[PDB]
Amino acid sequence: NIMRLVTPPLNTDPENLQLGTVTVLPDSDEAVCISFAITRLSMEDLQKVKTRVDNLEYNQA
């Protein structure tokens, strides 16, 4: 599709982990690479998220 409307293919296969998407410009050597890999959240990260929620509710108050 044209660059304004191009989108990556839709997939729902549980057996595969998506690492990212590669976009190729029309008839060119240039390509745009982006990573969208699902990544873990360690218990430290989840505690930091909880602290951010605490700060959000404090600011709401």
């Binding site: 057996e15 990212g20 190729v24 050597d29 690479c33 982006i34 990573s35 990544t39 873990r40």
Partner: protein
């Protein structure tokens, strides 16, 4: 089985996408996937070095 039931598939580290444009073939663009670690369907996937992949150029009109 236990890991996939608890958390599904996720990435631990690595697997970044970089475009190099190596001239293996005029109809392809070379892309490098950096080394990383991941758990797909609960099975660990630990790769020590990067992997080269190539995407065909777009010629559809």
């Amino acid at each position: 089985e236990r890991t996939y039931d608890e958390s599904g598939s996720y990435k631990v580290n690595g697997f970044e996408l970089f475009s190099e444009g190596n001239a293996e073939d005029d109809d392809h663009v070379s892309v490098v996937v950096d080394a990383g670690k991941a758990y797909v369907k609960g099975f660990k996937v630990d790769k020590p070095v990067s992997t080269r992949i190539s995407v065909p150029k777009s010629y559809d009109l």
